[PDB]
Amino acid sequence: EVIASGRLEKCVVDGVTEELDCQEKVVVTLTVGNGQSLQTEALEFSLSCLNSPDGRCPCSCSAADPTCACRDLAAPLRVSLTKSPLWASYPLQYLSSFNWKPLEVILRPSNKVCKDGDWEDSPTCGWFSQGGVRVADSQGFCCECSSSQVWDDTFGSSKERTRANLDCDFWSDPLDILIGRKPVSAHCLTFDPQWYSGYELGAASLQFEIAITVEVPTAPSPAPQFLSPPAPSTREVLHLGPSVPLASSASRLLSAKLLGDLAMYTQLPAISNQVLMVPQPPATNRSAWMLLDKTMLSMDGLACDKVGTGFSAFRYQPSGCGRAPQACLSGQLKDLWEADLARIADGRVPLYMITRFTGGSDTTLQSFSGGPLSFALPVTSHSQSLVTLSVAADGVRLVTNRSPGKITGAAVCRFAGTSCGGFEAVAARGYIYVNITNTGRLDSDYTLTVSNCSSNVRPIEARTLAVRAGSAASLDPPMELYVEDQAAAAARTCTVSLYDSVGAVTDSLTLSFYTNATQLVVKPSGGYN
Amino acid sequence: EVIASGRLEKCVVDGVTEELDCQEKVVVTLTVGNGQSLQTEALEFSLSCLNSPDGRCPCSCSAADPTCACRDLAAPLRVSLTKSPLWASYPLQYLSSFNWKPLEVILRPSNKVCKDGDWEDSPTCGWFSQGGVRVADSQGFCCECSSSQVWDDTFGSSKERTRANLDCDFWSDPLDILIGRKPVSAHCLTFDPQWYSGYELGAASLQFEIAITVEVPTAPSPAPQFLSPPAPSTREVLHLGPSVPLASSASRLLSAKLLGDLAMYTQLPAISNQVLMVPQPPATNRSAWMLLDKTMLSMDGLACDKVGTGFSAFRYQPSGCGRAPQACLSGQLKDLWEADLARIADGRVPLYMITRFTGGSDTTLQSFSGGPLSFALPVTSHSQSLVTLSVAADGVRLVTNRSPGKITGAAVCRFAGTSCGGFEAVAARGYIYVNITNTGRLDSDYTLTVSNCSSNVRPIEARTLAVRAGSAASLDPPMELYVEDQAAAAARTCTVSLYDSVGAVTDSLTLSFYTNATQLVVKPSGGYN
Amino acid sequence: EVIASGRLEKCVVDGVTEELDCQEKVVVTLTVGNGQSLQTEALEFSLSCLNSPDGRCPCSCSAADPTCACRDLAAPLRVSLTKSPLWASYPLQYLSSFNWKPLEVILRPSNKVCKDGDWEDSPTCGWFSQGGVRVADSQGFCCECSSSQVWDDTFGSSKERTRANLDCDFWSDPLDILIGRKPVSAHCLTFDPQWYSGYELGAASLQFEIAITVEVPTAPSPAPQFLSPPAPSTREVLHLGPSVPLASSASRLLSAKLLGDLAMYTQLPAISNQVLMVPQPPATNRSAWMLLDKTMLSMDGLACDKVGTGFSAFRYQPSGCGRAPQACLSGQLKDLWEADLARIADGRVPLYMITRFTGGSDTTLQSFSGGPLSFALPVTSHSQSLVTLSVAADGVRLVTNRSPGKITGAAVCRFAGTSCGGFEAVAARGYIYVNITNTGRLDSDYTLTVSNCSSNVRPIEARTLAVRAGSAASLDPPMELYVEDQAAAAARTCTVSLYDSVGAVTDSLTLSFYTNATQLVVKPSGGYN
Ligand SMILES: *[C@@H]1O[C@H](CO[C@@H]2O[C@@H](C)[C@@H](O)[C@@H](O)[C@@H]2O)[C@@H](O[C@@H]2O[C@H](CO)[C@@H](O[C@H]3O[C@H](CO)[C@@H](O)[C@H](O)[C@@H]3O)[C@H](O)[C@H]2NC(C)=O)[C@H](O)[C@H]1NC(C)=O
Ligand SMILES: *[C@@H]1O[C@H](CO[C@@H]2O[C@@H](C)[C@@H](O)[C@@H](O)[C@@H]2O)[C@@H](O[C@@H]2O[C@H](CO)[C@@H](O[C@H]3O[C@H](CO)[C@@H](O)[C@H](O)[C@@H]3O)[C@H](O)[C@H]2NC(C)=O)[C@H](O)[C@H]1NC(C)=O
Ligand SMILES: *[C@@H]1O[C@H](CO[C@@H]2O[C@@H](C)[C@@H](O)[C@@H](O)[C@@H]2O)[C@@H](O[C@@H]2O[C@H](CO)[C@@H](O[C@H]3O[C@H](CO)[C@@H](O)[C@H](O)[C@@H]3O)[C@H](O)[C@H]2NC(C)=O)[C@H](O)[C@H]1NC(C)=O
Ligand SMILES: *[C@@H]1O[C@H](CO)[C@@H](O[C@@H]2O[C@H](CO)[C@@H](O)[C@H](O)[C@H]2NC(C)=O)[C@H](O)[C@H]1NC(C)=O
Ligand SMILES: *[C@@H]1O[C@H](CO)[C@@H](O[C@@H]2O[C@H](CO)[C@@H](O)[C@H](O)[C@H]2NC(C)=O)[C@H](O)[C@H]1NC(C)=O
Ligand SMILES: *[C@@H]1O[C@H](CO)[C@@H](O[C@@H]2O[C@H](CO)[C@@H](O)[C@H](O)[C@H]2NC(C)=O)[C@H](O)[C@H]1NC(C)=O
Ligand SMILES: *[C@@H]1O[C@H](CO)[C@@H](O)[C@H](O)[C@H]1NC(C)=O
Ligand SMILES: *[C@@H]1O[C@H](CO)[C@@H](O)[C@H](O)[C@H]1NC(C)=O
Ligand SMILES: *[C@@H]1O[C@H](CO)[C@@H](O)[C@H](O)[C@H]1NC(C)=O
Ligand SMILES: *[C@@H]1O[C@H](CO)[C@@H](O)[C@H](O)[C@H]1NC(C)=O
Ligand SMILES: *[C@@H]1O[C@H](CO)[C@@H](O)[C@H](O)[C@H]1NC(C)=O
Ligand SMILES: *[C@@H]1O[C@H](CO)[C@@H](O)[C@H](O)[C@H]1NC(C)=O
Incomplete structure (x- = not known):
C-alpha cells in the first residue's frame, strides 16, 4: 500500500565546499508486507528525459554529440518491491551439558559387601572424575535389610518397600544373616551415551531482506486500454534490511530508505x-x-x-x-x-x-x-515495513495486478496432522490449512481472512499471500485456532474469505469443525474420610 | 491525526482481460488512536458529481433520463473514524488441576496401631485411586514416640517437637508403653472440596475494531463562518481490525486499509x-x-x-x-x-x-x-493504528471539533481504593484518578498529561479521552504512579494538564501526594555471636 | 527522513461558538531517529508575510501603523529536530531482603553438650528473633559420633564424612566417650553484615524527549549556489515525548504531534x-x-x-x-x-x-x-519516532548537511575489554568497537553497517551516528557479535561500512576476528561399567 506520494525540494549542503545543491524529488512512502514474495505491483515514475547523468531534465548536452547519451524523451522508471521470508532469530549462549537419561544401576553383591563412604578409596559403584579430580558424592549409596524388615519377611511378608527388592527373609540365606551379613544393595548413577548441550x-531479532527492482529506461516504449509495451530498460536490484537500511541506484535516480516495521498484532x-x-x-x-x-x-x-x-x-x-x-x-x-x-x-x-x-x-x-x-x-503475524523512495522524476503512478481467486480447500487439523475435522477444546488447538488458486493470467496478491465465527472462537489474524499466475498456493505454516469454552461441539463455524489485491472478495467458504470436551486431569478419590 | 493527504493515479491490470483501468484518487493516511470512541472529527472529500456508478465524474449520462441517477453537482463525502476498546487477549492451554488447600489430617489411634507400608493393603489413612489404580505414596506416613522422647517426657519434658503433639510420658498410659505399644500418629493428606484448573x-494479541462511518451524498446541501447544513446522504459503516484489515464502500468510492499499529511506549x-x-x-x-x-x-x-x-x-x-x-x-x-x-x-x-x-x-x-x-x-498505552483511505474525489479537508475542558477532580489512591492521598514508596504504587468535563456544545477529543513532577517521580505516559458534549468523563483504568526513592514525603507534586483537540491547554492543576517510607523486611536478630 | 509533505485545509469547529475556522496548512510527517543528537538537517517553511498574529497572510493591517508588526515579506521558518538518548526504564516493586552470604558457624563444645530442641529455651546456637517473637527453626542443628563411627575410628579410620570433622576415635578422649559423652557439634546459621533489597x-517503558527548534523570522535575509545568510529570527524550543506527545509554537505558526515509534528490529x-x-x-x-x-x-x-x-x-x-x-x-x-x-x-x-x-x-x-x-x-536498536508538523506556510523544503567521513578504527573485543582480536564461539560474544571522524566543516548524520560477513556470523543491525564538524565519535555501547558455529577460526571477516547522510558510502573497511572453540562442560568419567 502507498502511504504518501508527492513532491519535495530536497537540498544538500556539501560538507567540504559548503555549496547548496537543490533538486525537486518525488517522495513515496509505502509498506512492504510480510508475504510480499512476488513483483505483483509497480510504481511508474515519469521521466522527462532519458540517460541523464545528473538526474536533471531537460538535457544540458546536444543529441548530435556522440558523447551525449541524454535524450529529451519520456519513459517510466518502473519500481517493484518484494520481501524475503521473515524470521525471528534468537542468539544462543552456551550454559552447560545435560544427559539424555541418567540411569540407576542396582547391584546386589553376593559377598554382602557394600562401601559408600565419602573417604572410601574403593567403593562398590566406583568414583567419577573430572580432569583427574574425584567428583564429590559420585560413589552412589548403599542399602541394607532393616532388623524389623528381616523379622517381618521371616514370619510373614514386609509391607515396607526396599529400593533393590531385597528378600529379607532369614531362610533366603540363613548362614550369612545369622553372622550379621544381611542382604545389601548398591545404587550407582550411570549416564546414557547421548548428551545434550x-x-x-x-x-528475538527480525531478519528479512527487501528487494527493490529498478527498471531504468534507456529509450521510449515502441474503448478498452492496455499496458504499454515495455521500454528498453536496464534492470537493477537494490537490497534493504535491518543490517543495511539504506540503498541508492547506480544512476542515483532512486534512493531508498527502510524506516522500520510497524508493531505485530500477535506478539512473538x-x-x-x-x-x-x-x-x-x-x-x-x-x-x-x-x-x-x-x-x-x-x-x-x-x-x-x-x-x-x-x-x-x-x-x-x-x-x-x-x-x-x-x-x-x-x-x-x-x-x-x-x-x-x-x-x-x-x-x-x-x-x-x-x-x-x-x-x-x-x-x-x-x-x-x-x-x-x-x-x-x-513469523506469521503481519510486520509491515515502511520504505521511503526518493526519485528525480516529474510524477508517479501505481500499477497493481488484480487476478481473481478461488479457495480449493480448507480444513481444521490437529498438531502434526494427526487427524482433520477438529481438535480438543482448550487443552489443544486446531490448525486452519487453506489451499487457494490464482485464476488469472497475472501474478497477484490476496488476503485470507477467518471471521463471522460461532460462539467462543478466538479471533484469527488475516494472512497475506502472493500467488503466481494460474498457480496453487497454501498457508504455510497454517493458522492457529483456539476455542474459549470447554464443551464438545459437532459443528463450530467460521467464514474463510479470499480477498483480491483491490480489497474485493473473489471467493468465500464456510469452514466447519468439531471440538472434543476438555479432558481434565482426573482427581484422586479415597484417602481419609 | 492526518499523516499524508494527496493525489495518486492508481491503475489496475485485470487478471483475466489484461486491460488497464486508471483513475486518480485522493489518498489519506491517518492514525486512529486508542481512546477514539466518538466521531469528533471528519474528512470531507469533495465530489464533482453525485450518484456516480463508476465513481468517475463528470456524468456520462443525461439528467433527463429516468434511469440516470448521476447529477453533475457538488457535495462532500464525510468520513469519520472510531476505535473500540483495545484488549491484549492471551490464549489458554490446559496443563493440570490444583487443589485450593490440601489439608493434613492427624489421627492418634487409641489401639496404638499405625500402618504406612508401601505394600500395605489396609493402611491407617487408606489409599487414593485414579481410574481404579492405586495412587503411589497416597497412604500418608506414621510417627511414634522416640525412646529418648519417652525418657525425657517421663523424667521431665521433651524439648524435641512431635508432629501430632504426642504425650510421650510413661505415666500418660503406662500399661501400653510397658508392653512396647508407644503413642503413635497417622498423617493423612486430604483435599479441599474446591479445585482449580x-x-x-x-x-498477547491486540484485539479491537475500527469503525469508519461513510456519509455518501445523494443531493447538495440546501464575518463569522458556520458549518453548512448536512447534504441528503446515505450512511454506511465499514469495519477494520487484525482479522479483516481490508474494507470498501458499496459504491467503491472509498476503500480503506488497516496498515498496522505503531509500537506501544510501555510494554504489555x-x-x-x-x-x-x-x-x-x-x-x-x-x-x-x-x-x-x-x-x-x-x-x-x-x-x-x-x-x-x-x-x-x-x-x-x-x-x-x-x-x-x-x-x-x-x-x-x-x-x-x-x-x-x-x-x-x-x-x-x-x-x-x-x-x-x-x-x-x-x-x-x-x-x-x-x-x-x-x-x-x-491496554492503556497508546497504540496508534495507521489507516489508509483511497477515495475517488477532487480533494479533501479535515473538520475537527474543538470543545474546551476542565479538570473537576484528581487524586492519588492506593490499590482497590483503600485510601486516597498517597501510597507506600517503592513497595507500592499509586493510582492517578482524574475527572474531566467537556464544557462545549460538541463531542471532542482531549489529552491528559502528568508532568513537571517533583524529584524521583517516574514519568507517566499521556492519556487520550473522547468526551461527549457537556458530559463528564474519568480515566478508566487509572494512571499508575511510582516513585524512585524510598523516603517518606509529605507533598510530592505533579502538573495534571488537559489539552484540547488542537493541542492547547484548556485546564491545568497541581496534584499533590504523600509517600510512606518503604517498610523493608525486618532482619532477624540474635543467633551465635 | 521525510515520509509525507503536502497541503491540507484544516478546519476547526469551536465548541462554544459553533463557528468554523478554516486554514490551509503544510503537513509534514517525518522520523526522528534514535541517535539524532545534532541539528544536522532543517525544514524551511516559506512564509509570504512576517510577524503575522493570526498566522494568515497577506497582512490585514498597514505597515504605516506603529501597532502593526506584520510585513508582506518573504523569509523561511527553519525547523530542526533532535532526540535525547533513548532508555528502557523498568519500575521497581520491593519484594524481600536477602543476605550477601549466610555462613555456617561450627561449634565443637568442650563439655560435649549440644541442645537443638524445638522447645529448648537455651540452645547451643541461640535463637533469632523478629520483633520480639522467636524465629522458628533458627536454633540450628546438632551432630554426634555414630556408634559405628566410634568403632571404625578406634580400630582404623571411619570412611563416613562428619560435618564438623569430628575425631570419633576412643583414644582421642577416652574418659568422656566411656561414660557416653561422645564428641558433639553445633551448626549455627549466621549472616554476612551486608544485606540486599x-x-x-x-x-519496560521507552523514555526520551524530542526537541524541535523553531526559528521564526522577524525580517528577510540581508555557477555554484550557497546557503542564504540567516534571516533575523526568534528561536523557540518545543519538547515532545511519551508523557507530553503534543506541542505548539507561541505564534501557533507550528503545531507538532508525536504519533509514536515504529517497532524495534531487536527486542529488549x-x-x-x-x-x-x-x-x-x-x-x-x-x-x-x-x-x-x-x-x-x-x-x-x-x-x-x-x-x-x-x-x-x-x-x-x-x-x-x-x-x-x-x-x-x-x-x-x-x-x-x-x-x-x-x-x-x-x-x-x-x-x-x-x-x-x-x-x-x-x-x-x-x-x-x-x-x-x-x-x-x-536502547541500541533503532526506534524511529513519527512526528507530524502542521505549519501555516506556502510550502516547504528540506536542507540536509552532508559531511564526508572516515573509519579511524574498528576492533572485536571481549566483555569489559579483557582482550581485543576475537572471542569464544557460542559460549561468549564479541563487541564491535568503531571509531569514526566527520571530515567535513558541517555537523552531519552517518550510518555504520556490518555486512558481507564470513560463514555463520549472526546479522548485526545498523547504527545511526550524529557527529560534530571535524570531530571524532565512537559507538557507545558497542555492537554485539555472535557466531553460529562452535569451531575455532583464525580470521572471520565482516565489512564495516560508513554511509553519509545521503546514503553514499564515504568509508569502508574489513574487520577481522578470531574465535576460540566452544569450551563445553567436561563430562564425568568412571562410575559403574
Ligand atoms: C471428537 O469428536 C468427534 C465428533 O464429535 C462428536 O460426534 C459424535 C460422536 C457426537 O457425540 C457429537 O455430539 C460430537 O460432536 C468424533 O468424531 C466422530 O467419531 C465417530 C466414531 O468414530 C463417528 O461415528 C461414525 O463413524 C462412521 C461414519 O463416519 C461409522 O461407520 C461409525 O459406525 C460411526 O457411527 C463420527 O462420524 C465422527 N464425527 C465427525 C464429525 O467426524 C471424534 O472421534 C472425537 N475424537 C476423539 C479422539 O474422541
Ligand atoms: C502515610 O503518610 C501520611 C502522611 O505523611 C506523613 O504525615 C505526617 C504524619 C508526618 O509524619 C509527615 O512527615 C509525613 O509526610 C499519613 O497521613 C497522616 O496521618 C496522620 C494521622 O492519622 C494525620 O494526622 C492528623 O489527622 C487529623 C487531622 O487530619 C487529626 O485529627 C489527628 O489528630 C492528627 O493530628 C495526618 O493529617 C495525615 N496526613 C495526610 C497528608 O493525610 C498516613 O497515615 C501514612 N500511612 C500509613 C499507613 O502509615
Ligand atoms: C583464541 O585464539 C587466538 C587465535 O586463534 C588461534 O591462533 C593460533 C594459536 C592457531 O591455533 C589458530 O588455528 C587459531 O585460530 C589466540 O591467539 C593467539 O595466541 C598465540 C599464543 O599466545 C599467539 O602466538 C604467538 O604470539 C606471539 C606473536 O604474536 C609470539 O611471541 C608467540 O611465541 C606465539 O608464536 C598468536 O599470535 C595469537 N593469535 C592471534 C590472532 O591473536 C588466543 O590466545 C586464544 N584465546 C585463548 C584464551 O585461548
Ligand atoms: C491442499 O492440496 C493438497 C494437494 O496439492 C492436498 O494434499 C493431498 O491430499 C490427498 C488426500 O489426503 C493425498 O492423497 C495427497 O498425497 C496430498 N498431497 C500432498 C502434496 O500433500 C491437501 O490435503 C489440500 N489441503 C486442503 C486443506 O484442502
Ligand atoms: C470523580 O467523580 C465521582 C462522582 O461522579 C466521585 O465519586 C463520588 O465520591 C463521593 C465522595 O467520596 C461519593 O459520595 C460518591 O458516592 C462517589 N460517586 C461515585 C459514582 O463513585 C469521584 O470521587 C471523583 N474522583 C476524583 C478523583 O475527583
Ligand atoms: C578509539 O580511539 C581511542 C582514542 O581516542 C582509542 O583508545 C586509546 O587506545 C590507546 C591504545 O590502547 C590507549 O593508549 C589510550 O589510552 C586509549 N584512549 C582512550 C581515551 O581510551 C581506542 O582504542 C580506539 N578504538 C578503536 C576500536 O580503534
Ligand atoms: C535427524 O536426527 C535423527 C536422530 O535419531 C535421525 O533419526 C534423522 O534421520 C535425522 N535426519 C532428519 C532429516 O530427520
Ligand atoms: C456471517 O457468518 C456466516 C457464517 O457463519 C456467513 O454466512 C455470513 O456471510 C457472515 N456475514 C457477515 C456480514 O460477515
Ligand atoms: C463470583 O464468585 C464468588 C465466589 O465465592 C462469589 O462470592 C461472587 O458473588 C461471584 N460473583 C461476582 C459478580 O463477584
Ligand atoms: C513546572 O511544574 C510546576 C508544578 O510543579 C508548574 O506550576 C509549572 O507550570 C511547570 N512549568 C512548566 C514549564 O512545565
Ligand atoms: C560503588 O560501590 C563499591 C562498593 O564496594 C565501591 O567499591 C565503589 O568505589 C563505589 N563507587 C563507584 C563509583 O564504583
Ligand atoms: C563482500 O564482502 C567482502 C568482504 O568479506 C567485501 O570486500 C565486498 O566489498 C563485499 N561485497 C558486497 C557486494 O557487499
Missing part, C-alpha cells in the same frame, strides 16, 4: 531465557532439539527429578532406600521427549519439542539461512 | 508462560482467578510448599515427624490468595490475583467479549 | 519478572547491583542452595551431619557475583551482574536521569 536463548512466543537443548555430535537437523523453561532444570545438579539432576541429589535423597528404583531420576530429557510424543498422539501440542511453534513440521525451520547453532521461527 | 497463557505485562488458575465449576466471574509464575508450582507434585504439592512430597519429607503439622503444605492457592488480601489491606499490590493489572476493580475485565475461558487486559 | 522489575532483553538486588545502605552506584531470575531464589527460605535459603532449609537438610560444612549454603549472592567475576576473566558474559547488558562498563547506565531506585538500559 544447553544454550540460553537471547532476545515468550521463549527468551529458555534453554535450547541441542544433541552433542558423535544441513542442520533441528528435529531432536528441545526448548525448556528454567524451572524444568537443575543447573547445579543438587535437585531431584529435574534436567541436570546429579550425584548429590541422587546420593542424599530422603528415605532413598525406601523409594522405588529410578526415584529422583524422573523428568529427564528422554522422559519429556516421550511425554511430548504421547501428547502429539492425543491430539495435544508438545510442551518441550521446538516443533510446538511450527504446528507439526520440522521442514519449515529448515529453509532458514543461519549456521549449525542458530535458532529462528517463521 | 491451571491454563498456561500464550502470547510479561504474563506469557504464567499459569492462570480458574475455579472448577460445581457472564464470566474472573474475581476468584489467579495468574501464577511457574516457580510457585510443583507440576509433578514431588516438591513441598508449592501449588501442586502431592503425595510423595508429603510422605517422604526430611524429619517429617519432627516438623509442625501442615509442614510441606504452605504456599497453596488458599495461602497465596490470603497473602494477597493481606497485601491489599496494607496498601500493597497483589502478586497472584489477576486484579493486580486493572488497579483494584474486577468490573473492568467484565466488558471483554471473549468466552468463559478467555483472559484479556485493557 | 530485592525488587521485582515491571514492564526479557528482564521483566526478574529480581533486582540492590545493596542495603549502611549519584547512584549501580556497580554492585544484580538482576536475578526467580529460579535462583527461595522466597519463603524453605529451599536449600538458593538466594533466600533460610533457617528451616538449613536445619532439616537430608543427612545434614554427613554433608560437608556450608552445604545448603551454595548459590548465594556472594557466590553468583564471584562466579560472574570468574566468567568475565574467562572472556565470558556475566549471568547475574547488571553490566551483562551494557557490554562491560558501569559508566553507561550512570548518564540516566532516574532516582536512586530506578533501573534502565540504553
